[PDB]
Amino acid sequence: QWIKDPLNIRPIAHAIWDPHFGEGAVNAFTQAGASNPVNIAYSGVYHWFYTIGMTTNQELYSGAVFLLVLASL
Amino acid sequence: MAESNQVVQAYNGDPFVGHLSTPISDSAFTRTFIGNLPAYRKGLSPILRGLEVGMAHGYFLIGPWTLLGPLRDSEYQYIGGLIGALALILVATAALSSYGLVTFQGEQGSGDTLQTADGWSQFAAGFFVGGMGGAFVAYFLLENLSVVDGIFRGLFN
Amino acid sequence: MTISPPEREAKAKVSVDNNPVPTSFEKWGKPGHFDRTLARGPKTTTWIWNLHANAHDFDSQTSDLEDVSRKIFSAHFGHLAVVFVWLSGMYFHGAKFSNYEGWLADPTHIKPSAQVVWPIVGQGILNGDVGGGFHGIQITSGLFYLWRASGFTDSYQLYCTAIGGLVMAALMLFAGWFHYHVKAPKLEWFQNVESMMNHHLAGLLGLGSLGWAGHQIHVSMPINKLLDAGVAPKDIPLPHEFILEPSKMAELYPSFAQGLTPFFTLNWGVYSDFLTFKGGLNPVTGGLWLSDTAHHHLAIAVLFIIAGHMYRTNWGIGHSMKEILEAHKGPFTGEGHKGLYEILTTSWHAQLAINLALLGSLTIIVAQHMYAMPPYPYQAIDYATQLSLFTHHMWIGGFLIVGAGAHGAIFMVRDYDPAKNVNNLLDRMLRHRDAIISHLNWVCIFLGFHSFGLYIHNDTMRALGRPQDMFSDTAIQLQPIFAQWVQHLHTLAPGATAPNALATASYAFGGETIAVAGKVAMMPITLGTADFMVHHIHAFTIHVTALILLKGVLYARSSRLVPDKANLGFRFPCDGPGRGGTCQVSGWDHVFLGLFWMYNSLSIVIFHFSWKMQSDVWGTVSPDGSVTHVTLGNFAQSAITINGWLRDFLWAQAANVINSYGSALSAYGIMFLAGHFVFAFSLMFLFSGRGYWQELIESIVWAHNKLNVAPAIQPRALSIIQGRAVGVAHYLLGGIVTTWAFFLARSLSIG
Amino acid sequence: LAQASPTTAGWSLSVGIIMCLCNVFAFVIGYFAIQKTGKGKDLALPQLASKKTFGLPELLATMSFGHILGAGMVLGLASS
Amino acid sequence: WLTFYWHWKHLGVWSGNVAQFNENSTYLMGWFRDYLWANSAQLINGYNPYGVNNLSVWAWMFLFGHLVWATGFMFLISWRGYWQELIETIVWAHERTPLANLVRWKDKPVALSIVQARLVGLAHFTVGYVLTYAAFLIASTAGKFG
Amino acid sequence: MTELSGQPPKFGGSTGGLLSKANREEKYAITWTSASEQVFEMPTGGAAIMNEGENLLYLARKEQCLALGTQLRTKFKPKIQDYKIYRVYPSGEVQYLHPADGVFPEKVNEGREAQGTKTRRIGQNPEPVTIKFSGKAPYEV
Amino acid sequence: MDGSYAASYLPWILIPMVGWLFPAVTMGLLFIHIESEGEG
Numbered sequence A: 001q002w003i004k005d006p007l008n009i010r011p012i013a014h015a016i017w018d019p020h021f022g023e024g025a026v027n028a029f030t031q032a033g034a035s036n037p038v039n040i041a042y043s044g045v046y047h048w049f050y051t052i053g054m055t056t057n058q059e060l061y062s063g064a065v066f067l068l069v070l071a072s073l
Numbered sequence B: 001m002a003e004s005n006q007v008v009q010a011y012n013g014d015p016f017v018g019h020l021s022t023p024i025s026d027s028a029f030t031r032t033f034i035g036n037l038p039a040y041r042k043g044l045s046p047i048l049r050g051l052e053v054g055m056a057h058g059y060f061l062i063g064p065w066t067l068l069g070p071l072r073d074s075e076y077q078y079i080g081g082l083i084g085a086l087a088l089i090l091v092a093t094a095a096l097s098s099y100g101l102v103t104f105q106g107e108q109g110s111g112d113t114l115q116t117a118d119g120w121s122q123f124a125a126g127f128f129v130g131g132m133g134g135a136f137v138a139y140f141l142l143e144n145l146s147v148v149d150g151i152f153r154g155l156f157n
Numbered sequence C: 001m002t003i004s005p006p007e008r009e010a011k012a013k014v015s016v017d018n019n020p021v022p023t024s025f026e027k028w029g030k031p032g033h034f035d036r037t038l039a040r041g042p043k044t045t046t047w048i049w050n051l052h053a054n055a056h057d058f059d060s061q062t063s064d065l066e067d068v069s070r071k072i073f074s075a076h077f078g079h080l081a082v083v084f085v086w087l088s089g090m091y092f093h094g095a096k097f098s099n100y101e102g103w104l105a106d107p108t109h110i111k112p113s114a115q116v117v118w119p120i121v122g123q124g125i126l127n128g129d130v131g132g133g134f135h136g137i138q139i140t141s142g143l144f145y146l147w148r149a150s151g152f153t154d155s156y157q158l159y160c161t162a163i164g165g166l167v168m169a170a171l172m173l174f175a176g177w178f179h180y181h182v183k184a185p186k187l188e189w190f191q192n193v194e195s196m197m198n199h200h201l202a203g204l205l206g207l208g209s210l211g212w213a214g215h216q217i218h219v220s221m222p223i224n225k226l227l228d229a230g231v232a233p234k235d236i237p238l239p240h241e242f243i244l245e246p247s248k249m250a251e252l253y254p255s256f257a258q259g260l261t262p263f264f265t266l267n268w269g270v271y272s273d274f275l276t277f278k279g280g281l282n283p284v285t286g287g288l289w290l291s292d293t294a295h296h297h298l299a300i301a302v303l304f305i306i307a308g309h310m311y312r313t314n315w316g317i318g319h320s321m322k323e324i325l326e327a328h329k330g331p332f333t334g335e336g337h338k339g340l341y342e343i344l345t346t347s348w349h350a351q352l353a354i355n356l357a358l359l360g361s362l363t364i365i366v367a368q369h370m371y372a373m374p375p376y377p378y379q380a381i382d383y384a385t386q387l388s389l390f391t392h393h394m395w396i397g398g399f400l401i402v403g404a405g406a407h408g409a410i411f412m413v414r415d416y417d418p419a420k421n422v423n424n425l426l427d428r429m430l431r432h433r434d435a436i437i438s439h440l441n442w443v444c445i446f447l448g449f450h451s452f453g454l455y456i457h458n459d460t461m462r463a464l465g466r467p468q469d470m471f472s473d474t475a476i477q478l479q480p481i482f483a484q485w486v487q488h489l490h491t492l493a494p495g496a497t498a499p500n501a502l503a504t505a506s507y508a509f510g511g512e513t514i515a516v517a518g519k520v521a522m523m524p525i526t527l528g529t530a531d532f533m534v535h536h537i538h539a540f541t542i543h544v545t546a547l548i549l550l551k552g553v554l555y556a557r558s559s560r561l562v563p564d565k566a567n568l569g570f571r572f573p574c575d576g577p578g579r580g581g582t583c584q585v586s587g588w589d590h591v592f593l594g595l596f597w598m599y600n601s602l603s604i605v606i607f608h609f610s611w612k613m614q615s616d617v618w619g620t621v622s623p624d625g626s627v628t629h630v631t632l633g634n635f636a637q638s639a640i641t642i643n644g645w646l647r648d649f650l651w652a653q654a655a656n657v658i659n660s661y662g663s664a665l666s667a668y669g670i671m672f673l674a675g676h677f678v679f680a681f682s683l684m685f686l687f688s689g690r691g692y693w694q695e696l697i698e699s700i701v702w703a704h705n706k707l708n709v710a711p712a713i714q715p716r717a718l719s720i721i722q723g724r725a726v727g728v729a730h731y732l733l734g735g736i737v738t739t740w741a742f743f744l745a746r747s748l749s750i751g
Numbered sequence D: 001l002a003q004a005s006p007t008t009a010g011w012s013l014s015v016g017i018i019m020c021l022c023n024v025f026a027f028v029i030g031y032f033a034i035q036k037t038g039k040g041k042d043l044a045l046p047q048l049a050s051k052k053t054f055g056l057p058e059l060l061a062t063m064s065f066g067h068i069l070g071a072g073m074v075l076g077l078a079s080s
Numbered sequence E: 001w002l003t004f005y006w007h008w009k010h011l012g013v014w015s016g017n018v019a020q021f022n023e024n025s026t027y028l029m030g031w032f033r034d035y036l037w038a039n040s041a042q043l044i045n046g047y048n049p050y051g052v053n054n055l056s057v058w059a060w061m062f063l064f065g066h067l068v069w070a071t072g073f074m075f076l077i078s079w080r081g082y083w084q085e086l087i088e089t090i091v092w093a094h095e096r097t098p099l100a101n102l103v104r105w106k107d108k109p110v111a112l113s114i115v116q117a118r119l120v121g122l123a124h125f126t127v128g129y130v131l132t133y134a135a136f137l138i139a140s141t142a143g144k145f146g
Numbered sequence F: 001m002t003e004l005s006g007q008p009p010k011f012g013g014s015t016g017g018l019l020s021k022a023n024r025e026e027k028y029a030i031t032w033t034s035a036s037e038q039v040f041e042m043p044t045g046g047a048a049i050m051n052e053g054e055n056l057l058y059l060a061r062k063e064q065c066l067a068l069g070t071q072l073r074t075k076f077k078p079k080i081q082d083y084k085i086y087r088v089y090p091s092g093e094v095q096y097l098h099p100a101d102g103v104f105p106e107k108v109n110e111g112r113e114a115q116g117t118k119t120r121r122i123g124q125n126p127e128p129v130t131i132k133f134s135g136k137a138p139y140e141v
Numbered sequence G: 001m002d003g004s005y006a007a008s009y010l011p012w013i014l015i016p017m018v019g020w021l022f023p024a025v026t027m028g029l030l031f032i033h034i035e036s037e038g039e040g
């Protein structure tokens, strides 16, 4: 989604799972179009992965599995 | 160094004992992991060993009948699982006790306080109490699965 | 001294002895000559049996490895001559007692037949009307389909082929005689394993598929191209006309206009009209595209010829297999493959165990690949041929595998030298045989409980009016999700991970429903709960057979029970009633038990094949497009219980066998009862022991002495080992003949 | 028609730029990798530089290997 | 043989069709098809993919008798030494498995004896024989006339 | 019986050797001298190497020891006939077993007392009915 | 607390496993280890 409208969409880093949250915080952190609590990323990693030619979640997942293998090596 | 890159050796240095020292049989990890299970953990009284083994077993034995028993598609699903697991742990306790009764008729040894009539009976007592307790607490958690779900999701605060 | 040719060696490693064994007939009249314990003659009837029992046991006849090797080589030539006689007989019956040309002119309205029965004592009824006024026995060997794919169109070509086969048999026979009696090759010659492998890879398998690619391109492909186009077989040119008139090829394949130049310049794509990667099947015939098979044989030939260059012989280039083997050793396995080169270059039984195991596995792979990727025109629509070929290759493979167990055991008893196997793979296998076998034992128990036990659970639940408590596709599901996933991968492959392929490798994985005439040739073979359960039955029975034979090999030398078993031999009945009883400890007895378990495994495999193909694949298709299967999709709900197999498979489909009286199928009912009788007969030998029979023979010998009619060759009851051998031979014969009659009646009576 | 595109006898690129180059590469790695280079039945005498350097079997085998390499490379560089 | 005879003849008699036995008992395919194969149809349908009836118990017992018979075949064909060696491997496995180590047998596990194998194989064989034929007899006669 | 001596054979181990019976019940020992370091077959599976000089090996049964002994005296170019087989109890008691009187049992040796000898033929055993309700069998009387 | 991503039942039990079970077990192991008075 961020690839489509990269200037108006905020990139999200990962989902939040905290049993401490109340209703207010749950509402406050379902943001950036997400349907569940989420943090927005500030590592610039979306811009990096998009610039170097990656466009789908399948590519990122294949990269992460390859890095699992490289770390194993 | 030297020439022994070999990972398998004679078991305990006696090649003529019918066993081999292998990564599964006699690695440092398995020695420390098996040797610290309730059955072998040093200095434990057999009552605590039985209690721990029974907790683990009673806890996990509730599942098969809970999801796959005949009452799984009834209003008494978790009660059905509990009844099954309790009856199974009762039969298991009778088996353990009969074993102790038959194998320790003669002179009692000395090195292993679990390998005696008194020790195996204490193990059976601990196993009974732990098995019944673990089965009942697994049943209680399952019978109130909605409150556990709301707890884990924060649906109550 | 017989015939003395010049020499025939050209700086070769060829080395022979001239005339070691003179040609003579005297020993033909001296039966048992090859065994010292037999040469004097018989005194009891046991002498007869052992004469047949040890006829090919060349080790037990001579201790000289060279003479054993020579006997084996000439025996191989004799066996090849036998196979040639048989194959030329097949081709002759196709030439003179078949309706081959008539079938070729119209293969959708005529049943292949190639055996005519003489009219005597009523048996003439076996000459069933197979179409076109032809009357005979319907054949299920697929000979017609092979002959059509090869491009046969005339009786005279089959006759010429039969004559060539007879000449080849004569040549093989003469070569066997020549290399045993006239020029016998030395032991040094047989041990040239590197050269033998180079030649069998590049020369036997590589040049074989190269020459066959040549025949397919020049004879099979244009002739079948015209046959499938509707051209009558008489209007089609003879095979040599396409080579004399290259314009015929060029108009059937425009690339031929360019000739061989694209080949030598690596411009192979020009050849894309006859070297193809279509996949799928031929729409007219239901078989694999012959162009695909020609491209396949070309690539296989290139592969094998390249492979035939790995090993060093006379020119320094290449590999020593001894070096390679010795280099492969690790922290888990001591010295590794050290000693394997010496074992496999001095022990015939070790080589035979390897080769039996692999050749049986290959025969099974052949059955499995030929059913789903039908290679011949009109074989898939002929469900009888399909079932028969699958089951035949299955049985051959199983027997070869059990033999591999036998010869691993014989190696252990006769050729294993402990001084030549110190801390190598074989030694370590022996040194943890207990771990191996106890674990295989437990895996078999687990696999049996959680496969057959699932069936028992389902039977009991269904009988108790509790269908919702069963393992089924409509209750508690056991979906084989990994096989489904790989099938999906195969179906997606033509468009992704196999781009230059047009269709799937097989429609069983998924895709279109290929039907020729009104019957389906192949269609997606879906997998569900019943398929899961029967696959685990297969894994279970294979594991038990492996358990038995592997225990046989690993304990052939010794066990905790019998620490000197090696001194007792490979074949022996026991070591007495002591130690609680030691019957059947030998490797031979492990082979004897593994035979029954292999028969069990394969019976279930072939029943699974028959029922699944009749229920979910085979059938007739309406012009509307829909399919109606032979047994109406009953597999999923019926194959999940033992009662389902007893009633909906065995009971239902046996109706053809038992009603075959009064028709051309009557012989199949006859042989159904025959197999049953032989099976029952085997139980006498298996359930008893020779002592009872020896005493009964004592009474009968008294009867004979009473009338002065007792023979000098005293009757003895069969030996313990022979009782078991007879029992198992009859068990397998009877059961297999039963299933054979059943299968043929069924698959011939189902359209 | 969906068929991998090869190349007609280029005889400028197909030859030295690929086939002879792959043959020279096979020459080099065989020279540096064959245990028994000149232990063949056939001496094929005048030991030279590379074209016919060490032994007839060395030459023939490294040349067959160079042709395998060159066939693979020509076909690959021309699509597939 | 005796009971097959009695039952097939009495089936023909009770049904009024003595001709079936009179004409088809002279050859063994007649027994195989008209007697054994036919009179199983209801028996093997005591339970079904479509439901259950009162012959369900007899179908289950029919399969049970088959299974017991086949099990007896094992004790009858495979003899003792093969089993004692396998049990030696299993004994080894028990002695060397931790946790299971804690437990030891009071009696040493050994394979069945020679005579015992003959007796037990025969006992299975006979149990299966009787239960199989009783299931068939009862179910067939009660499905036709019961 | 004093104290068994001899190097153990060079061997990497196996699963086929001693079990619980060896420590709970009884085990067996075989000693022998070898003129050379050389390979032999373990009755429990695989190959081992005997040392030059004295050798001492523990096995689970008497039969495994006698099988190794036959292998020693019938399968080596210079024979090995000096092997001795002992029974060993958990208490430490060692019972010399074979060869019983220092002479192999296949050949006569003076001083041996006949055991299990009968002064009759097999056919001269008494009828079982004549000895029924006793504890004996026709070969025990 | 929910999740629309794939296999959203995984944080449900992994968050307690990472926050409660993993630290309890690793601290217990390290505790018994640093207090181990086996000679050496």
Ligand code: CLA
Residues within 6 Å of the ligand: C500, D004, D068, D069, D070, D071, D072, D073, D075, D076, D077, D079, D080
């Ligand atoms: C600069 C050099 C060069 C270039 C770039 C190419 C380029 C190409 N080659 Mg080529 N090749 C070369 C050199 C080169 N080749 C040489 C020197 C040789 C001689 C050995 C070959 C021989 C070769 C063959 C035989 C083939 C190619 C193929 C291809 C295409 C492969 C497409 C693909 O993804 O494969 C496929 C991708 C996969 C992931 C498949 C792998 C899965 C396999 C089936 C696993 C099998 C395991 C196997 C049994 C284990 C081996 C046994 C043992 C020895 C270890 C590609 C365009 C293929 C082609 O032309 O397609 C039409 C093909 O058939 N090449």
Ligand code: CLA
Residues within 6 Å of the ligand: B090, B091, B093, B094, B095, B097, B098, B128
């Ligand atoms: C009237 C006398 C009496 C009574 C009230 C009990 C009562 C009890 N016994 Mg005991 N038992 C008795 C006599 C008695 N026992 C005797 C004489 C022996 C020696 C043979 C045993 C040996 C025995 C063992 C080994 C065990 C018990 C156990 C138990 C408890 C489990 C419930 C049960 O077994 O069902 C009720 C039982 C009866 C109504 C019949 C009692 C009389 C018979 C002979 C008892 C036979 C024991 C049997 C092998 C175990 C039953 C298996 C189980 C699945 C029920 C229970 C409270 C189990 C336990 O948890 O102990 C902590 C167990 O492990 N009993």
Ligand code: CLA
Residues within 6 Å of the ligand: C072, C073, C076, C077, C080, C189, C190, C192, C193, C195, C196, C199, C200, C202, C203, C204
């Ligand atoms: C390219 C050379 C070549 C070929 C084709 C063969 C082929 C064969 N060998 Mg042989 N072998 C060779 C070289 C070769 N070998 C060398 C160099 C050695 C010494 C190391 C051996 C030593 C060896 C031994 C010890 C044995 C064999 C055996 C066999 C046969 C068993 C396999 C089989 O039955 O397949 C299928 C069978 C056939 C296809 C039948 C055809 C057989 C005919 C005679 C071959 C004619 C081909 C010939 C080159 C003419 C072709 C030219 C033209 C017509 C195209 C087989 C026919 C075994 C055997 O069966 O002994 C008889 C055997 O035990 N080989």
Ligand code: CLA
Residues within 6 Å of the ligand: C210, C211, C212, C213, C214, C215, C217, C242, C243, C246, C249, C255, C256, C258, C259, C260, C263, C264, C265, C271, C298
């Ligand atoms: C053992 C199998 C076999 C057999 C015996 C034949 C036999 C025959 N084929 Mg056939 N063919 C085969 C396999 C086989 N083929 C395969 C696998 C293919 C697929 C590639 C083909 C495809 C094919 C085609 C397209 C044609 C034939 C043709 C022919 C006939 C004439 C060719 C010939 O031999 O003249 C003698 C050959 C030569 C003198 C070759 C010299 C020409 C070149 C320039 C020499 C180069 C060689 C040199 C060492 C390599 C270096 C080159 C590099 C430096 C540039 C002949 C009867 C031709 C025909 O008659 O059609 C009916 C024809 O057009 N075949």
Ligand code: CLA
Residues within 6 Å of the ligand: C052, C053, C054, C055, C056, C057, C058, C352, C356, C399, C400, C401, C402, C403, C404, C406, C410, C571, C588, C591, C729, C733
């Ligand atoms: C290329 C395959 C191959 C090779 C050449 C050998 C070679 C050999 N085997 Mg082996 N073996 C094989 C496959 C093979 N076997 C298979 C497939 C099996 C599984 C059944 C075995 C199982 C096996 C056993 C158990 C034994 C051997 C033995 C032997 C040796 C003696 C041969 C013999 O028995 O003489 C003569 C052959 C016979 C008397 C066969 C007659 C009985 C057959 C089975 C009747 C078949 C009936 C027919 C097919 C159909 C019915 C027709 C009827 C109605 C008229 C010999 C060196 C024996 C040995 O001691 O090895 C040293 C032995 O103990 N093999």
Ligand code: CLA
Residues within 6 Å of the ligand: C440, C441, C442, C444, C445, C446, C447, C448, C449, C452, C453, C456, C544, C547, C548, C593, C596, C597, E067, E070, E071, E072, E073, E074, E075, E077, E078
């Ligand atoms: C249908 C007849 C039959 C049956 C039931 C068996 C049973 C078995 N055979 Mg056997 N066999 C048979 C015929 C049979 N055999 C014959 C005729 C021969 C002669 C060749 C052999 C020769 C043979 C050999 C040589 C070997 C076997 C092996 C095995 C075992 C395989 C492991 C296993 O399946 O674990 C699980 C057990 C089962 C699936 C049996 C059914 C259990 C049911 C479904 C559940 C039980 C319900 C419950 C316990 C009932 C309790 C009632 C209550 C009142 C107490 C197994 C127990 C192999 C073995 O031992 O592997 C380790 C082995 O090596 N068999």
Ligand code: CLA
Residues within 6 Å of the ligand: A014, A015, A016, A017, A064, G010, G011, G012, G014, G015, G018
């Ligand atoms: C170091 C990389 C990294 C980091 C920092 C995180 C961070 C997080 N993950 Mg994730 N994870 C990772 C890699 C990582 N992940 C990978 C590669 C996978 C695929 C195997 C997953 C699969 C995974 C799942 C299924 C889940 C999380 C979840 C979470 C969150 C809760 C913690 C948890 O339960 O983790 C659990 C982690 C695992 C079960 C797999 C182990 C992760 C890697 C392979 C090991 C990392 C080792 C690390 C480098 C050691 C260095 C530590 C250092 C201090 C010395 C958390 C924000 C939960 C979540 O999404 O929250 C809502 C959730 O349920 N992770």
Ligand SMILES: CCCCCCCCCCCCCCCC(=O)OC[C@H](COP(=O)(O)OC[C@@H](O)CO)OC(=O)CCCCCCCCCCCCCCC
Residues within 6 Å of the ligand: C328, C329, C330, C331, C332, C333, C334, C335, C336, C337, C425
């Ligand atoms: C459906 C398949 C997916 C499910 C996964 C199942 C996992 C099964 C276990 C993984 C395989 C382990 C063997 C490789 C591991 C391996 O080979 O490691 C390597 C090691 C030897 O390595 P070395 O360094 O000594 O190599 C030197 C060589 O040159 C040989 O001398 O092997 C051993 O240690 C022998 C022990 C084998 C005993 C394990 C076998 C257990 C039998 C069950 C295996 C089932 C496989 C079924 C698949 C068809």
Ligand SMILES: CC1=C(/C=C/C(C)=C\C=C\C(C)=C\C=C\C=C(C)\C=C/C=C(C)/C=C/C2=C(C)C(=O)CCC2(C)C)C(C)(C)CCC1
Residues within 6 Å of the ligand: A059, A060, A062, A063, A064, A066, A067
């Ligand atoms: C035959 C041969 C040649 C032909 C080669 C051919 C035909 C293809 C070669 C392709 C190659 C050599 C591909 C190399 C890929 C290397 C990669 C991909 C390395 C590292 C990736 C890393 C370290 C991780 C990256 C990450 C990932 C995973 C992410 O997803 C996020 C970004 C980042 C974190 C960076 C030529 C003729 C040329 C020379 C002669 C020999």
Ligand SMILES: CC1=C(/C=C/C(C)=C/C=C/C(C)=C/C=C/C=C(C)/C=C/C=C(C)/C=C/C2=C(C)CCCC2(C)C)C(C)(C)CCC1
Residues within 6 Å of the ligand: B055, B056, B057, B059, B060, B129, B130, B132, B133, B134, B135, B136, B137
């Ligand atoms: C992962 C892994 C593993 C595994 C593990 C397992 C298999 C386990 C499971 C686990 C378990 C299985 C656990 C458990 C838990 C339990 C518990 C925690 C319990 C309980 C109980 C209770 C708490 C009770 C109480 C009571 C009583 C006692 C009395 C009164 C009543 C009541 C109920 C109150 C290992 C390490 C091997 C390896 C690596 C990986």
Ligand SMILES: CC1=C(C/C=C(\C)CCC[C@H](C)CCC[C@H](C)CCCC(C)C)C(=O)c2ccccc2C1=O
Residues within 6 Å of the ligand: C684, C685, C686, C688, C689, C690, C693, C716, C717, C718, C719, C720, C722, C723, C724
């Ligand atoms: C019946 C039986 C016998 C008696 C069987 C005997 C004595 C064999 C009789 C064979 C006859 C003499 C030959 C008939 C078969 C011929 C081989 C077939 C030749 C046919 C041609 C003439 C065409 C045993 O010796 C025995 C031993 C161990 C376990 C079980 C049994 C067992 O069950």
Ligand code: SF4
Residues within 6 Å of the ligand: C573, C574, C575, C576, C577, C578, C581, C582, C583, C584, C689, C720, E079, E114
């Ligand atoms: S019954 Fe037969 S096989 Fe078994 S021990 Fe006795 S003689 Fe040997």
Ligand SMILES: [Cl-]
Residues within 6 Å of the ligand: C462, C638, C641, C643, C644, E047, E048, E049
């Ligand atoms: Cl059913």
